[PDB]
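Job type: complex structure
Entries:
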Amino acid sequence: QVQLVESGGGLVQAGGSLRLSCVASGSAPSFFAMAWYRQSPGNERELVAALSSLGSTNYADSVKGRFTISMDNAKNTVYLQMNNVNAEDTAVYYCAAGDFHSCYARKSCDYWGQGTQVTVS
Amino acid sequence: NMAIIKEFMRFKVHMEGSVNGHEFEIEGEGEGRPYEGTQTAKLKVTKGGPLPFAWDILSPQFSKAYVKHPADIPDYLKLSFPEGFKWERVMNFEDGGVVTVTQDSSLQDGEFIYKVKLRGTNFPSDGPVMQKKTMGWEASSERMYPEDGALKGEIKQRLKLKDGGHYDAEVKTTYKAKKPVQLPGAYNVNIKLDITSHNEDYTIVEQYERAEGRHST
C-alpha cells in the first residue's frame, strides 16, 4: 500500500511557471514508477509525464519541452516542473504510481493522489 | 548622448541561470530616469519557478545607465551607447556561496536591452540563501576606479537576515564599453535596492533602485 499526497498547485499567469510535488509513503514495490495525469472540464483524463525507476521519461506531445518530471528519492518526492504555462494547461492534475509494468510501460497505475487544481489566467 | 538617452527610458531584460543546479529563466520589463538615478522593474519567472532559493541574490543583476552623475565625473557607461557595454561580476558570500554573472547592455529601437547569465554554486543547503532566510540588501557604496582599459567596481554588500544578524558578500565587477569612451577617475556610487512587491512564491517580483555617484570621501 502506497499513499500519494500532492502539493504546489493553484493560480498562475500565462507564460509563468509553477512546480507540482507529491510525497509517497507506505511500502513501495520494486521498480517503483510515478506519473502525472490531468483532466480538464468535460474531457477524459490524459497522461502528462511518466518517470521510471531507472530514469526513463515519457511526455505527452502537448507538454514536451515545457514540463519536466523528476524525483528526489531521499525525500520520497516526485515533481512536475511546469514552464511557460498556457490556457490549455488548466486542469485537475493527479499524481499516480505503480511499478514499471503497471504505470510506466502501461497506463494502469495502482495508486492515485487526491488531485490538484491548476488554473492559468 | 542626451539625444538618444532620454530623460525617461524603458528596458527589457532576460536572465538564464542556475543556483546549486536548479535551472531557471526570468523575463522582465523596466523603466526609469537615467539622469536622476531612479528605476523600477517587474520580473517574471518563466522557467523553473518557484525558485528554491532567496530572490535577493538575483535582484542586483537586473542597470548602470541609470546612475546620477556629477557633471565633472565622466558617465562612461552612458557614453557607451547606442552600442552599449558589458559586465562580469563575482559575488563571494561569506559562507562559501559563489555567484558569477555576465551581462550585455545595448540600445535597440529606443529601449535598453539586457541579457544576463548567472551561475550560483557552493551554497550550503542549510544556509540562508537556499533556506530563503534573507530580508533585503542594506544600502551599498560601490567603489569605482579605472583599471586595464575598463571600469572596476568593488562592494562589501550586506543582506539582512530574517532571524537577526546579517550576511555579507565581497563583490567585484568589471564594466567595459564596447567602444573606447572616456573613463572617469576614482569615485563612489551610493545605491539602495528595494523589493517593492512580490507574489507569494516570488515568481512575480517588483524592484526599485536609486543610485548616485559622487567624489570619493
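Summary: Chain A touches chain B at residues 12-13, 15-19, 81, 83-84 (CB under 8 Å). Residues 100-104 of chain A form the longest helix (5 residues).
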